A paper describes a structure:
DING is a family of proteins with molecular mass of approximately 40 kDa, with a conserved N-terminal sequence of DINGGG. DING proteins are one of three families within a superfamily of bacterial phosphate-binding proteins. To date, the crystal structures of two DING proteins, i.e. human phosphate-binding protein (HPBP) and DING protein from Pseudomonas fluorescens SBW25 (PflDING), have been reported.
In the present study, HPBP with a single mutation was unexpectedly crystallized during a crystallization trial of a certain protein–RNA complex, as was the case for the first crystal of HPBP. We attempted to crystallize a protein complex composed of proteins of 53 kDa, 52 kDa and 11 kDa in complex with its substrate. After crystallization trials and optimization, small crystals were obtained, and a high-resolution X-ray diffraction dataset (1.35 Å resolution) was collected. The crystal belonged to space group C2 with unit-cell parameters a = 94.3 Å, b = 87.1 Å, c = 88.6 Å, β = 90.82°. However, the calculated asymmetric unit (727644 Å3) was too small to locate any of the components. The results of SDS-PAGE of these crystals indicated a protein with a molecular mass of approximately 40 kDa that corresponded to none of the target proteins. To identify the observed protein, it was digested with trypsin and the resultant fragments were analysed by LC-MS. Mascot search of the obtained molecular masses suggested HPBP, a member of the DING protein family, as a candidate. Taken together, it is plausible that HPBP was a contaminant in the BSA used for substrate preparation.
Author numbering: 1 to 376
The structure:
Amino acid sequence: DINGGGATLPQKLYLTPDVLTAGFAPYIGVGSGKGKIAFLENKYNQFGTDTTKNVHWAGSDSKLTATELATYAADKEPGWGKLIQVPSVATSVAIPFRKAGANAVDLSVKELCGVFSGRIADWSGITGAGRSGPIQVVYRAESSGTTELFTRFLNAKCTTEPGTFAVTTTFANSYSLGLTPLAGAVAATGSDGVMAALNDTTVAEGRITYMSPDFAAPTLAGLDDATKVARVGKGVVNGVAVEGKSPAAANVSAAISVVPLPAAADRGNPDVWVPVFGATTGGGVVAYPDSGYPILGFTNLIFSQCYANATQTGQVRDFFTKHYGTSANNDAAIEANAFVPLPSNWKAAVRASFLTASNALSIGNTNVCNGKGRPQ
């Protein structure tokens, strides 16, 4: 079997029949931090107890760090080939909450920032929401790509809190003044563990969190129910009151469509393949959009260019052919699970480097992978 796992944000997508193609074992959702370790160190123990199995790929919504990349290049690349890091799909980060009320909850960015810094501790501080009583933040206990995507937004946009939010996979380490300002914030493990805490009816109402849109509501329609999933983006633009948007994929697709391709000359560097959003556009960073739903990013795949086993090599190529295909692809499934397909130019770029046989970066390239590859 080809063994993969990691990020929980897209786990239900990868578990959907026929999204992963022939030869792939069922995806094991354990978090992006564990997915990166599993791949980089070939440690199946991050996925399960059968450590005779080898790891072949990971899902991650946390980018590979400079240290991770350099260590793999020195330790693993000579025998296993280059690693490949590519976007899989684009995603919003949803803000589901448990607090009854007929009114739409529509967070301004300033309000969102105050909720997650602890400055706003009561629902009455959310204008127009018609709710009052304590807010309780639920967050991911472990190294999480959802946390990275979310804190990247807070770092860029929460610019008038007492403290500042650092970009991190560990939410408890983000705010400069710590979690102490929050009263009774609750940590849970996995997208599912956080949603279970959010939905726990044995505690008082008031909980709020950040979440994969595939987990944030039971169906796509539920993402548009602003009594359960917050709109974000409420404000005033050119003198006129604007409403925020739901985290439905339709509200981030336009912004995703104009994300620049990775710089051609540097496409051998896995770091350039995953765009990150930031306050301002420039130097590889893409500005968070001023229209549509504001909190977005990419979730990614990590693969090897080379596999020791030729059948596995072919099966990996078949998966890339589908997932990045012009047609006969996974786009319908991607949308059904609340995500945004990659734009056509992005699919073409991924194919041109990693599929097209003549390219030096292509999976299973006979010249590059001659006598090399990850173990089967």
